[PDB]
Protein backbone atom coordinates (compact mmCIF):
# COMPACT_ATOMS: atom_id res chain seq x y z
CA UNK A 1 0.00 0.00 0.00
CA UNK A 2 0.86 3.71 -0.02
CA UNK A 3 -0.58 6.02 2.64
CA UNK A 4 -1.58 9.19 0.77
CA UNK A 5 -3.80 12.21 1.32
CA UNK A 6 -5.83 12.47 -1.90
CA UNK A 7 -6.76 9.38 -3.91
CA UNK A 8 -6.34 9.35 -7.69
CA UNK A 9 -6.71 6.55 -10.23
CA UNK A 10 -3.39 5.83 -11.94
CA UNK A 11 -5.03 3.40 -14.39
CA UNK A 12 -8.58 2.82 -15.57
CA UNK A 13 -8.85 -0.50 -13.68
CA UNK A 14 -8.56 1.10 -10.22
CA UNK A 15 -11.88 1.03 -8.35
CA UNK A 16 -12.76 3.00 -5.23
CA UNK A 17 -14.11 1.17 -2.18
CA UNK A 18 -14.76 2.33 1.39
CA UNK A 19 -13.61 -0.17 4.03
CA UNK A 20 -13.02 0.28 7.77
CA UNK A 21 -14.09 3.92 7.56
CA UNK A 22 -11.49 4.88 4.95
CA UNK A 23 -11.36 4.97 1.15
CA UNK A 24 -8.97 2.50 -0.49
CA UNK A 25 -7.72 2.41 -4.07
CA UNK A 26 -7.62 -1.28 -4.97
CA UNK A 27 -6.09 -2.33 -8.29
CA UNK A 28 -6.06 -5.81 -9.82
CA UNK A 29 -3.68 -5.54 -12.78
CA UNK A 30 -1.04 -3.37 -11.05
CA UNK A 31 -0.65 -3.98 -7.30
CA UNK A 32 1.56 -0.87 -7.09
CA UNK A 33 -1.55 1.31 -7.48
CA UNK A 34 -2.84 0.33 -4.02
CA UNK A 35 -3.39 3.55 -2.05
CA UNK A 36 -4.75 4.25 1.42
CA UNK A 37 -6.32 7.46 2.69
CA UNK A 38 -4.95 8.72 6.01
CA UNK B 1 -43.46 -10.60 -7.31
CA UNK B 2 -41.40 -13.07 -9.34
CA UNK B 3 -39.37 -16.01 -8.03
CA UNK B 4 -36.85 -18.29 -9.73
CA UNK B 5 -37.14 -22.07 -9.35
CA UNK B 6 -34.24 -24.37 -10.25
CA UNK B 7 -34.88 -28.12 -10.30
CA UNK B 8 -32.48 -31.01 -10.94
CA UNK B 9 -34.21 -34.08 -12.42
CA UNK B 10 -31.87 -36.79 -13.71
CA UNK B 11 -28.94 -34.79 -15.12
CA UNK B 12 -31.49 -32.31 -16.52
CA UNK B 13 -31.76 -28.80 -15.07
CA UNK B 14 -34.98 -26.79 -15.45
CA UNK B 15 -35.09 -23.09 -14.53
CA UNK B 16 -38.39 -21.21 -14.62
CA UNK B 17 -39.89 -18.03 -13.18
CA UNK B 18 -43.28 -17.89 -11.48
CA UNK B 19 -45.33 -14.77 -10.75
CA UNK B 20 -46.70 -14.30 -7.23
CA UNK B 21 -49.58 -11.93 -6.50
CA UNK B 22 -48.33 -8.57 -5.23
CA UNK B 23 -50.08 -6.26 -2.74
CA UNK B 24 -51.01 -2.92 -4.29
CA UNK B 25 -50.93 0.66 -3.08
CA UNK B 26 -53.73 1.86 -0.84
CA UNK B 27 -56.58 3.46 -2.82
CA UNK B 28 -56.86 7.00 -1.42
CA UNK B 29 -53.71 8.97 -0.54
CA UNK B 30 -54.17 12.29 1.28
CA UNK B 31 -52.05 14.12 -1.34
CA UNK B 32 -52.85 12.67 -4.79
CA UNK B 33 -50.74 15.27 -6.63
CA UNK B 34 -47.45 14.24 -5.03
CA UNK B 35 -44.54 12.87 -7.04
CA UNK B 36 -42.53 10.59 -4.74
CA UNK B 37 -44.30 8.06 -2.48
CA UNK B 38 -43.02 9.62 0.76
CA UNK B 39 -44.48 13.07 0.08
CA UNK B 40 -47.62 11.58 -1.48
CA UNK B 41 -48.83 10.38 1.94
CA UNK B 42 -47.72 13.51 3.87
CA UNK B 43 -44.88 11.49 5.41
CA UNK B 44 -42.31 14.17 4.58
CA UNK B 45 -40.14 15.02 7.62
CA UNK B 46 -42.30 12.81 9.85
CA UNK B 47 -40.53 9.42 10.04
CA UNK B 48 -37.62 8.17 12.13
CA UNK B 49 -35.72 4.91 12.62
CA UNK B 50 -38.48 3.67 14.94
CA UNK B 51 -41.05 3.61 12.11
CA UNK B 52 -40.64 -0.06 11.21
CA UNK B 53 -43.99 -0.15 9.39
CA UNK B 54 -42.58 2.33 6.86
CA UNK B 55 -39.03 0.99 6.51
CA UNK B 56 -40.33 -2.57 5.98
CA UNK B 57 -41.86 -1.64 2.60
CA UNK B 58 -38.59 -0.52 0.95
CA UNK B 59 -36.32 -3.46 1.85
CA UNK B 60 -35.62 -6.90 0.40
CA UNK B 61 -36.57 -10.10 2.27
CA UNK B 62 -32.87 -10.67 3.10
CA UNK B 63 -32.12 -7.24 4.57
CA UNK B 64 -31.12 -5.45 1.38
CA UNK B 65 -32.76 -2.29 0.10
CA UNK B 66 -34.62 -1.94 -3.19
CA UNK B 67 -33.16 0.35 -5.88
CA UNK B 68 -34.46 3.89 -6.24
CA UNK B 69 -35.65 3.21 -9.80
CA UNK B 70 -38.20 0.59 -8.73
CA UNK B 71 -39.53 2.47 -5.70
CA UNK B 72 -39.62 5.92 -7.28
CA UNK B 73 -38.45 7.85 -4.22
CA UNK B 74 -36.68 11.15 -4.70
CA UNK B 75 -32.92 11.22 -4.19
CA UNK B 76 -33.17 13.34 -1.04
CA UNK B 77 -35.61 10.95 0.64
CA UNK B 78 -33.95 7.77 -0.66
CA UNK B 79 -30.73 8.54 1.22
CA UNK B 80 -32.72 9.28 4.38
CA UNK B 81 -34.62 5.99 4.05
CA UNK B 82 -31.35 4.17 3.38
CA UNK B 83 -29.80 5.69 6.51
CA UNK B 84 -32.81 4.76 8.65
CA UNK B 85 -32.72 1.13 7.49
CA UNK B 86 -29.04 0.87 8.44
CA UNK B 87 -29.84 2.36 11.85
CA UNK B 88 -32.89 0.10 12.22
CA UNK B 89 -30.87 -3.08 11.63
CA UNK B 90 -28.17 -2.09 14.12
CA UNK B 91 -30.82 -1.12 16.68
CA UNK B 92 -32.05 -4.73 16.87
CA UNK B 93 -35.32 -4.16 15.02
CA UNK B 94 -36.32 -6.14 11.92
CA UNK B 95 -35.34 -9.63 13.17
CA UNK B 96 -37.00 -11.55 10.31
CA UNK B 97 -35.00 -9.81 7.55
CA UNK B 98 -31.70 -11.56 8.29
CA UNK B 99 -30.37 -14.34 6.04
CA UNK B 100 -30.86 -17.91 7.25
CA UNK B 101 -27.69 -19.89 8.01
CA UNK B 102 -28.36 -23.10 9.98
CA UNK B 103 -24.68 -23.86 10.64
CA UNK B 104 -23.81 -20.45 12.10
CA UNK B 105 -26.64 -20.08 14.60
CA UNK B 106 -25.48 -22.94 16.85
CA UNK B 107 -22.05 -21.45 17.77
CA UNK B 108 -23.38 -18.62 19.90
CA UNK B 109 -21.15 -15.67 20.76
CA UNK B 110 -21.02 -12.85 23.29
CA UNK B 111 -24.55 -11.58 24.06
CA UNK B 112 -25.72 -8.76 21.83
CA UNK B 113 -25.28 -5.28 23.31
CA UNK B 114 -28.44 -3.22 22.92
CA UNK B 115 -27.91 -0.05 20.89
CA UNK B 116 -29.85 2.56 18.95
CA UNK B 117 -29.21 5.61 16.76
CA UNK B 118 -25.83 4.22 15.66
CA UNK B 119 -24.51 6.39 12.84
CA UNK B 120 -21.44 4.28 12.01
CA UNK B 121 -20.86 0.52 12.01
CA UNK B 122 -19.74 -1.37 15.13
CA UNK B 123 -16.53 -2.66 13.50
CA UNK B 124 -15.26 0.66 12.08
CA UNK B 125 -14.99 2.96 15.12
CA UNK B 126 -11.84 3.28 17.22
CA UNK B 127 -11.80 4.11 20.95
CA UNK B 128 -11.38 7.79 21.86
CA UNK B 129 -8.33 7.36 24.06
CA UNK B 130 -7.54 11.10 24.15
CA UNK B 131 -10.87 12.92 24.54
CA UNK B 132 -9.56 16.40 25.29
CA UNK B 133 -10.67 19.43 27.24
CA UNK B 134 -13.69 21.61 26.50
CA UNK B 135 -11.96 23.87 23.97
CA UNK B 136 -11.16 20.88 21.69
CA UNK B 137 -13.56 18.04 22.50
CA UNK B 138 -13.96 14.85 20.45
CA UNK B 139 -17.73 14.35 20.36
CA UNK B 140 -19.25 10.92 19.77
CA UNK B 141 -21.80 11.11 16.92
CA UNK B 142 -25.38 10.00 17.56
CA UNK B 143 -27.97 9.75 14.81
CA UNK B 144 -27.43 11.08 11.32
CA UNK B 145 -27.34 14.61 9.89
CA UNK B 146 -29.77 13.47 7.18
CA UNK B 147 -32.52 13.43 9.84
CA UNK B 148 -31.96 16.97 11.17
CA UNK B 149 -34.87 18.28 9.06
CA UNK B 150 -37.51 16.26 10.94
CA UNK B 151 -40.26 18.16 12.73
CA UNK B 152 -39.43 19.12 16.32
CA UNK B 153 -42.52 19.50 18.50
CA UNK B 154 -40.39 20.63 21.44
CA UNK B 155 -38.75 23.23 19.20
CA UNK B 156 -35.21 22.61 20.45
CA UNK B 157 -32.74 21.46 17.77
CA UNK B 158 -31.72 17.82 17.91
CA UNK B 159 -28.29 17.23 19.46
CA UNK B 160 -26.53 15.18 16.79
CA UNK B 161 -23.03 15.27 18.33
CA UNK B 162 -22.79 14.30 21.99
Amino acid sequence: FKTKGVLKKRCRDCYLVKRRGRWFIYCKTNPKHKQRQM
Amino acid sequence: FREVVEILDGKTTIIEGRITETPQESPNPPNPTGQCPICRWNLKHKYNYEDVLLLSQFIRPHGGMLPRRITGLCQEEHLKIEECVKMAHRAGLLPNHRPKLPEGFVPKSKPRLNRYLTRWSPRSVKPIYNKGHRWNKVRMPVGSPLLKDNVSYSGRPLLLYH
Binding site: - | F1, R2, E3, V4, G17, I19, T22, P23, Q24, E25, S26, P29, P37, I38, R40, W41, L43, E50, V52, L53, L54, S56, Q57, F58, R60, P61, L66, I70, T71, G72, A91, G92, L93, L94, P95, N96, H97, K110, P111, L113, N114, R115, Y116, L117, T118, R119, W120, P122, V125, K126, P127, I128, Y129, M140, P141, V142, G143
Partner: protein, 177 residues
Protein backbone atom coordinates in the same frame (compact mmCIF):
# COMPACT_ATOMS: atom_id res chain seq x y z
CA UNK C 1 -52.10 15.67 61.31
CA UNK C 2 -52.67 15.56 65.11
CA UNK C 3 -49.77 13.14 65.44
CA UNK C 4 -47.64 13.09 68.51
CA UNK C 5 -44.30 14.87 68.34
CA UNK C 6 -42.15 11.73 68.12
CA UNK C 7 -44.05 9.77 65.40
CA UNK C 8 -44.62 12.96 63.38
CA UNK C 9 -40.89 13.57 62.98
CA UNK C 10 -40.24 9.91 62.17
CA UNK C 11 -42.85 9.84 59.40
CA UNK C 12 -41.56 13.06 57.81
CA UNK C 13 -37.93 11.86 57.65
CA UNK C 14 -38.71 8.26 56.64
CA UNK C 15 -36.58 6.31 54.17
CA UNK C 16 -38.31 5.10 51.00
CA UNK C 17 -37.06 2.34 48.70
CA UNK C 18 -37.55 2.70 44.95
CA UNK C 19 -37.31 0.16 42.13
CA UNK C 20 -35.98 1.19 38.72
CA UNK C 21 -36.01 -1.21 35.78
CA UNK C 22 -33.13 -1.01 33.33
CA UNK C 23 -34.26 -3.12 30.38
CA UNK C 24 -32.95 -1.24 27.31
CA UNK C 25 -32.50 2.09 29.10
CA UNK C 26 -29.48 4.39 28.67
CA UNK C 27 -27.33 4.65 31.80
CA UNK C 28 -27.30 8.44 31.60
CA UNK C 29 -31.08 8.74 31.75
CA UNK C 30 -31.04 5.97 34.36
CA UNK C 31 -28.53 7.92 36.47
CA UNK C 32 -30.32 11.27 36.18
CA UNK C 33 -33.41 10.13 38.08
CA UNK C 34 -31.38 7.86 40.37
CA UNK C 35 -29.12 10.75 41.39
CA UNK C 36 -32.12 12.86 42.44
CA UNK C 37 -33.56 10.16 44.70
CA UNK C 38 -30.25 9.46 46.44
CA UNK C 39 -29.72 13.12 47.33
CA UNK C 40 -33.33 13.61 48.36
CA UNK C 41 -33.97 16.44 45.87
CA UNK C 42 -37.55 15.18 45.51
CA UNK C 43 -38.48 15.89 49.16
CA UNK C 44 -39.68 19.46 49.86
CA UNK C 45 -37.92 19.05 53.23
CA UNK C 46 -34.54 18.75 51.48
CA UNK C 47 -31.41 20.21 53.06
CA UNK C 48 -27.77 19.23 52.61
CA UNK C 49 -27.03 19.19 56.35
CA UNK C 50 -29.97 16.86 57.00
CA UNK C 51 -29.43 13.15 56.35
CA UNK C 52 -32.46 12.82 54.07
CA UNK C 53 -31.90 10.08 51.51
CA UNK C 54 -33.74 7.25 49.77
CA UNK C 55 -32.57 3.82 48.68
CA UNK C 56 -32.73 2.99 44.97
CA UNK C 57 -32.75 -0.57 43.59
CA UNK C 58 -31.84 -0.93 39.90
CA UNK C 59 -32.42 -4.29 38.22
CA UNK C 60 -31.54 -5.60 34.75
CA UNK C 61 -28.34 -3.59 34.41
CA UNK C 62 -26.82 -6.02 31.90
CA UNK C 63 -29.37 -4.94 29.27
CA UNK C 64 -28.63 -1.20 29.21
CA UNK C 65 -28.62 0.39 25.75
CA UNK C 66 -25.89 2.92 25.03
CA UNK C 67 -27.03 5.42 22.41
CA UNK C 68 -25.02 5.76 19.22
CA UNK C 69 -21.58 4.19 18.88
CA UNK C 70 -20.68 4.82 22.53
CA UNK C 71 -20.21 1.07 23.09
CA UNK C 72 -16.90 1.27 21.20
CA UNK C 73 -15.90 4.94 21.56
CA UNK C 74 -16.38 5.81 25.24
CA UNK C 75 -13.48 4.58 27.37
CA UNK C 76 -13.14 4.28 31.15
CA UNK C 77 -9.58 4.86 32.35
CA UNK C 78 -7.90 4.45 35.72
CA UNK C 79 -4.36 4.38 37.09
CA UNK C 80 -3.17 1.80 39.62
CA UNK C 81 -0.46 4.18 40.86
CA UNK C 82 2.55 2.06 39.98
CA UNK C 83 4.63 3.20 36.98
CA UNK C 84 3.30 1.84 33.72
CA UNK C 85 -0.07 1.14 35.30
CA UNK C 86 -2.33 3.29 33.12
CA UNK C 87 -5.22 1.12 31.92
CA UNK C 88 -7.87 2.30 29.45
CA UNK C 89 -10.85 -0.02 28.93
CA UNK C 90 -13.49 0.34 26.22
CA UNK C 91 -17.12 0.61 27.29
CA UNK C 92 -17.93 -2.75 25.68
CA UNK C 93 -15.02 -4.48 27.43
CA UNK C 94 -15.89 -3.06 30.86
CA UNK C 95 -19.54 -4.11 30.58
CA UNK C 96 -18.44 -7.61 29.54
CA UNK C 97 -16.34 -8.02 32.70
CA UNK C 98 -18.33 -6.12 35.36
CA UNK C 99 -22.05 -5.98 34.45
CA UNK C 100 -22.90 -3.21 36.94
CA UNK C 101 -19.79 -1.06 36.43
CA UNK C 102 -21.30 1.11 33.69
CA UNK C 103 -24.32 2.20 35.73
CA UNK C 104 -22.40 2.57 39.00
CA UNK C 105 -19.74 4.83 37.47
CA UNK C 106 -22.38 7.00 35.79
CA UNK C 107 -24.14 7.64 39.10
CA UNK C 108 -20.85 7.92 41.00
CA UNK C 109 -19.93 10.91 38.83
CA UNK C 110 -23.26 12.74 38.94
CA UNK C 111 -23.69 12.98 42.73
CA UNK C 112 -22.27 16.03 44.54
CA UNK C 113 -18.52 15.80 45.06
CA UNK C 114 -18.64 16.31 48.84
CA UNK C 115 -17.96 13.65 51.48
CA UNK C 116 -21.62 12.60 51.52
CA UNK C 117 -21.16 10.93 48.13
CA UNK C 118 -19.54 7.90 49.77
CA UNK C 119 -22.37 7.70 52.30
CA UNK C 120 -25.17 7.99 49.74
CA UNK C 121 -23.57 5.49 47.34
CA UNK C 122 -23.99 2.75 49.97
CA UNK C 123 -27.76 3.13 49.60
CA UNK C 124 -27.59 2.23 45.89
CA UNK C 125 -28.24 -1.44 45.10
CA UNK C 126 -27.40 -2.82 41.65
CA UNK C 127 -28.23 -6.25 40.25
CA UNK C 128 -27.27 -7.61 36.81
CA UNK C 129 -30.61 -9.40 36.36
CA UNK C 130 -33.93 -9.97 38.14
CA UNK C 131 -32.34 -11.97 40.96
CA UNK C 132 -33.05 -9.91 44.09
CA UNK C 133 -32.92 -11.34 47.63
CA UNK C 134 -36.25 -11.52 49.43
CA UNK C 135 -35.02 -9.05 52.05
CA UNK C 136 -34.57 -6.28 49.47
CA UNK C 137 -37.88 -7.05 47.75
CA UNK C 138 -39.90 -6.57 50.94
CA UNK C 139 -38.49 -3.05 51.39
CA UNK C 140 -39.69 -1.64 48.06
CA UNK C 141 -42.51 0.91 47.84
CA UNK C 142 -43.01 2.01 44.23
CA UNK C 143 -41.39 1.57 40.82
CA UNK C 144 -40.17 4.61 38.90
CA UNK C 145 -41.26 4.86 35.24
CA UNK C 146 -38.74 4.10 32.53
CA UNK C 147 -37.21 7.32 31.13
CA UNK C 148 -37.01 6.00 27.54
CA UNK C 149 -39.91 4.42 25.67
CA UNK C 150 -38.64 1.10 24.31
CA UNK C 151 -39.50 0.77 20.60
CA UNK C 152 -41.09 -2.48 19.50
CA UNK C 153 -39.65 -4.72 16.81
CA UNK C 154 -41.41 -5.76 13.60
CA UNK C 155 -42.43 -9.18 14.94
CA UNK C 156 -44.07 -7.52 17.96
CA UNK C 157 -46.62 -5.66 15.82
CA UNK C 158 -50.05 -7.28 15.75
CA UNK C 159 -51.67 -8.17 12.44
CA UNK C 160 -54.28 -5.48 13.09
CA UNK C 161 -51.56 -2.82 13.16
CA UNK C 162 -49.96 -4.14 9.96
CA UNK C 163 -53.24 -3.90 8.04
CA UNK C 164 -54.02 -0.48 9.55
CA UNK C 165 -50.83 1.14 8.26
CA UNK C 166 -51.28 2.04 4.57
CA UNK C 167 -49.13 0.61 1.80
CA UNK C 168 -47.18 3.62 0.56
CA UNK C 169 -46.27 2.31 -2.90
CA UNK C 170 -47.22 -0.42 -5.37
CA UNK C 171 -44.20 -2.48 -6.49
CA UNK C 172 -44.26 -3.87 -10.04
CA UNK C 173 -45.33 -7.48 -10.44
CA UNK C 174 -42.31 -8.53 -12.52
CA UNK C 175 -39.59 -7.52 -10.03
CA UNK C 176 -37.69 -10.24 -8.16
CA UNK C 177 -37.07 -9.55 -4.47
Amino acid sequence: SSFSKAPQQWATFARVWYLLDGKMQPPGKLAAMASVKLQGLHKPVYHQLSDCGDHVVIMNTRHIAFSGNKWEQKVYSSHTGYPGGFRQVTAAQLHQKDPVAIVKLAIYGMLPKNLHRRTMMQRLHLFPDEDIPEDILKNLVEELPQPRKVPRRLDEYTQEEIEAFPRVWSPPEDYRL
